[PDB]
Amino acid sequence: KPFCSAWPSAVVPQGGHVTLRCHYRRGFNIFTLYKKDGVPVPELYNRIFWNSFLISPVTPAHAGTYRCRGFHPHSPTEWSAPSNPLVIMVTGLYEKPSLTARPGPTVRTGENVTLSCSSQSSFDIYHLSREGEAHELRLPAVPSINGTFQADFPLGPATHGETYRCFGSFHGSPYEWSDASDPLPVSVT
Amino acid sequence: KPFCSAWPSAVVPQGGHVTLRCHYRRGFNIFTLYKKDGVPVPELYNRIFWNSFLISPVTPAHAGTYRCRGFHPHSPTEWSAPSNPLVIMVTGLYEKPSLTARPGPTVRTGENVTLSCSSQSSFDIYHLSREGEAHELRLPAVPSINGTFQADFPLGPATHGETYRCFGSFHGSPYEWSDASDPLPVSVT
Amino acid sequence: KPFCSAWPSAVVPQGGHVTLRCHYRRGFNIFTLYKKDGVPVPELYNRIFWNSFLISPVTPAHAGTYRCRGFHPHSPTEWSAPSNPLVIMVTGLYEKPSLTARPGPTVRTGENVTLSCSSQSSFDIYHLSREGEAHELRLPAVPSINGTFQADFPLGPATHGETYRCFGSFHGSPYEWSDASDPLPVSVT
Amino acid sequence: KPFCSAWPSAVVPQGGHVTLRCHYRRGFNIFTLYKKDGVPVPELYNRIFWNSFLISPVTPAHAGTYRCRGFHPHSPTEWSAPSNPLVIMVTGLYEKPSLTARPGPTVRTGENVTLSCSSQSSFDIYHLSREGEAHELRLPAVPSINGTFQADFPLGPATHGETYRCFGSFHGSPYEWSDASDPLPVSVT
Ligand SMILES: *[C@@H]1O[C@H](CO)[C@@H](O)[C@H](O)[C@H]1NC(C)=O
Numbered sequence: 001k002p003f004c005s006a007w008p009s010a011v012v013p014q015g016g017h018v019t020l021r022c023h024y025r026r027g028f029n030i031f032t033l034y035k036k037d038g039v040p041v042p043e044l045y046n047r048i049f050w051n052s053f054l055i056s057p058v059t060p061a062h063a064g065t066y067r068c069r070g071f072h073p074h075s076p077t078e079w080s081a082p083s084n085p086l087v088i089m090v091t092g093l094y095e096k097p098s099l100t101a102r103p104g105p106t107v108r109t110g111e112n113v114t115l116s117c118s119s120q121s122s123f124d125i126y127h128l129s130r131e132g133e134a135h136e137l138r139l140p141a142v143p144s145i146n147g148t149f150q151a152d153f154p155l156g157p158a159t160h161g162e163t164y165r166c167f168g169s170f171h172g173s174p175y176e177w178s179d180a181s182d183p184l185p186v187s188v189t
Numbered sequence: 190k191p192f193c194s195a196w197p198s199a200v201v202p203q204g205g206h207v208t209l210r211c212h213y214r215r216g217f218n219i220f221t222l223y224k225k226d227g228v229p230v231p232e233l234y235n236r237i238f239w240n241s242f243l244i245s246p247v248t249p250a251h252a253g254t255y256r257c258r259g260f261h262p263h264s265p266t267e268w269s270a271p272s273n274p275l276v277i278m279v280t281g282l283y284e285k286p287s288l289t290a291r292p293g294p295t296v297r298t299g300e301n302v303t304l305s306c307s308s309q310s311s312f313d314i315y316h317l318s319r320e321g322e323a324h325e326l327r328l329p330a331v332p333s334i335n336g337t338f339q340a341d342f343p344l345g346p347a348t349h350g351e352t353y354r355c356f357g358s359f360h361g362s363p364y365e366w367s368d369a370s371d372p373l374p375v376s377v378t
Numbered sequence: 379k380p381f382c383s384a385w386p387s388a389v390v391p392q393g394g395h396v397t398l399r400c401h402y403r404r405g406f407n408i409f410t411l412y413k414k415d416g417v418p419v420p421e422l423y424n425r426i427f428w429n430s431f432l433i434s435p436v437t438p439a440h441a442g443t444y445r446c447r448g449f450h451p452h453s454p455t456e457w458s459a460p461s462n463p464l465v466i467m468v469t470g471l472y473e474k475p476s477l478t479a480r481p482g483p484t485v486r487t488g489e490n491v492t493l494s495c496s497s498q499s500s501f502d503i504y505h506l507s508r509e510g511e512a513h514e515l516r517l518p519a520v521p522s523i524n525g526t527f528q529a530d531f532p533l534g535p536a537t538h539g540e541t542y543r544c545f546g547s548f549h550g551s552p553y554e555w556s557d558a559s560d561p562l563p564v565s566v567t
Numbered sequence: 568k569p570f571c572s573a574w575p576s577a578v579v580p581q582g583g584h585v586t587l588r589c590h591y592r593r594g595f596n597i598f599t600l601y602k603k604d605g606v607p608v609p610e611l612y613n614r615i616f617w618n619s620f621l622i623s624p625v626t627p628a629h630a631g632t633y634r635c636r637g638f639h640p641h642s643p644t645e646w647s648a649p650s651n652p653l654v655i656m657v658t659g660l661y662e663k664p665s666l667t668a669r670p671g672p673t674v675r676t677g678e679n680v681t682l683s684c685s686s687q688s689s690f691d692i693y694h695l696s697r698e699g700e701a702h703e704l705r706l707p708a709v710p711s712i713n714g715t716f717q718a719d720f721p722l723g724p725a726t727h728g729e730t731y732r733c734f735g736s737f738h739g740s741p742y743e744w745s746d747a748s749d750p751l752p753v754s755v756t
């Protein structure tokens with residue numbers, strides 16, 4: 001199967017651009033796109049591209065999972081197995097959620113830290129992201145006694161200083177994210 | 190991942206200039222630029238640069254968060270991991286807030302100093318910066334008569350003499366700052 | 379260079395359908411499409427296809443001249459030379475001209491037959507096509523009372539019986555044709 | 568030096584698109600663009616691109632000669648020699664010239680054929696193009712006793728059937744071409 005990455009970023013703001021770049025050593029660098037998740041995009045249905053494919057400008061419809069088969073002319077199907085799943089995320093669609101820290105943004109080593117995303121928007125899911133990590137954490141949003149939709153991320157004992165932002169998303173659109181929270185720098189002393 | 194910095198300062202006055210610099214040890218100093226909080230200005234759109242890159246004059250449209258990947262030819266992605274956050278803040282957009290100290294400009298060593306940023310403008314976030322330390326503090330504004338918005342930065346024990354300034358910014362654009370407040374030098378006896 | 383053809387016909391009625399086909403012996407049947415007389419319709423913009431490609435329904439925006447390069451991976455350009463001209467003409471846009479024969483529908487073998495296309499419309503170019511022969515003839519229109527535009531196609535000696543039709547087209551759009559004239563069968567005794 | 572080609576066509580209609588694709592075996596596929604001829608384009612001045620560079624939409628300012636240096640980090644200049652000159656042509660800017668044949672579009676083998684481009688537009692140069700040949704012929708436009716600017720291409724004795732089109736261009740813009748002539752099919756019997 002081919003190796004497909006997003007350049008320069010899989011996480012792209014609304015109105016931005018992204019290039020789906022694929023490489024295939026077995027066969028040739030002629031690929032066919034496949035959008036698995038997200039809003040249906042007809043102009044992406046069985047679309048054949050060379051080396052790379054430029055999505056611009058990026059709309060909320062482009063958020064979702066993509067896969068690519070490489071041209072392998074001397075195989076039974078003349079096309080290869082699907083590539084690695086490539087998830088494209090679109091941000092800056094809804095109001096940004098507020099991010100706060102318990103007990104506070106500054107705590108000692110070995111102390112449990114728990115972040116909270118809050119919003120007046122009826123987000124179904126909250127996505128916490130840390131600067132440095134590409135692995136995003138996602139938790140369901142639960143209503144509070146204030147009229148806000150909230151989720152609490154328990155990070156556990158502190159090991160080193162980090163910086164967090166969070167996003168909100170409605171049902172049926174997990175990759176269509178809101179504006180990012182203001183950066184919350186967790187300092188570990 | 191590459192090391193990116195803004196020079197002479199990430200906090201750059203409108204009409205001023207800034208240089209996006211980056212250095213990459215593991216590979217080659219060919220860097221691709223991308224903005225995370227919105228679509229970039231045209232001369233920053235699809236921008237790959239060599240070593241450093243000069244922006245002049247600086248406009249409000251340059252304010253935001255940026256990342257860079259260094260050229261890593263012999264890797265799956267042919268590019269490095271996202272660099273350290275490359276933030277650009279533009280000042281001089283709104284009238285400067287007033288900065289006051291508590292208990293005052295001169296204080297005893299080990300005593301608590303609290304700096305209040307206050308304006309008639311309806312800022313959402315005040316930012317307290319210090320001379321010599323490229324580390325800004327963020328706080329939300331609060332209403333209080335006489336029809337003013339205010340934020341109190343408690344710095345804890347005062348160890349050494351330090352001069353401060355503060356900027357006002359509105360809710361939808363946290364990287365677009367007001368004119369700098371008059372400098373407040375705190376002396377420590 | 380690849381061989382490209384339109385099927386069932388390059389002369390295709392508006393609202394009708396056409397299939398762009400191509401075959402490439404020297405390399406692979408992966409073809410890139412491009413229009414030479416203007417920017418292409420969106421589903422033809424950045425269009426790479428496998429073997430053949432179906433257009434339905436056909437709109438006036440599809441009319442024009444096209445080329446195709448077959449996939450030639452192990453060459454400097456990684457693509458072939460431009461194919462044979464792939465022309466699309468759309469009919470049914472204007473009222474049909476009237477087609478007349480000289481001396482008439484039935485003629486002696488070896489005699490000269492001249493076909494006049496005539497309309498009240500101010501066409502710039504008349505196009506004479508024949509049933510069975512995928513080769514159209516082009517001629518400019520000429521003013522003459524009763525306030526009509528006309529073109530005379532001299533076919534020379536009449537060898538065999540053949541049915542003709544003609545289309546009118548205006549100066550700025552030579553690939554956008556009128557409705558077909560009533561068929562004129564020429565008999566040869 | 569790198570090998571740089573235009574995809575899918577160096578000859579691109581106004582409002583169209585073209586991709587400057589470069590390959591470099593010695594060093595890496597990081598290139599820097601250079602526009603030698605044509606109208607000055609600042610956003611193309613020392614612009615660094617990866618693998619390919621997409622010009623879209625194409626304007627008359629993009630017509631001209633391009634060269635590319637490849638990234639060769641362990642060389643005295645860290646960049647290589649300029650690539651092959653890549654001429655990009657923009658068509659469909661002015662009215663199309665008329666193309667006629669002397670003595671006629673149909674002649675016997677070994678007969679001298681001479682084409683003529685005519686126009687009411689003050690073209691300084693006429694460019695004859697043949698279907699199949701990438702080599703364009705250019706002749707200066709000379710005024711006639713009719714008020715038209717004309718040029719005569721003497722092709723000499725006929726060898727095989729061909730198809731010709733022609734373009735017109737004004738002074739100082741040799742690669743900014745008009746609309747193509749109607750195709751003139753020279754038949755050789
Ligand atoms: C963090 O939570 C875990 C689980 O309840 C607990 O075992 C641990 O003692 C806590 N750490 C601190 C510093 O409170």
Ligand SMILES: *[C@@H]1O[C@H](CO)[C@@H](O)[C@H](O)[C@H]1NC(C)=O
Pocket residue numbers: 301343344345346
């Ligand atoms: C001074 O600040 C320190 C740290 O912020 C705090 O522990 C202390 O209680 C404060 N004292 C007063 C009098 O506010």
Ligand SMILES: *[C@@H]1O[C@H](CO)[C@@H](O)[C@H](O)[C@H]1NC(C)=O
Pocket residue numbers: 490532533534535
């Ligand atoms: C008939 O047509 C042929 C070829 O076009 C021409 O040589 C001949 O002179 C014509 N005869 C008449 C009577 O028009």
Ligand SMILES: *[C@@H]1O[C@H](CO)[C@@H](O)[C@H](O)[C@H]1NC(C)=O
Pocket residue numbers: 677678679723724
């Ligand atoms: C074509 O022109 C050349 C040069 O004048 C001449 O030698 C030749 O005989 C001409 N051919 C014909 C068929 O007239």
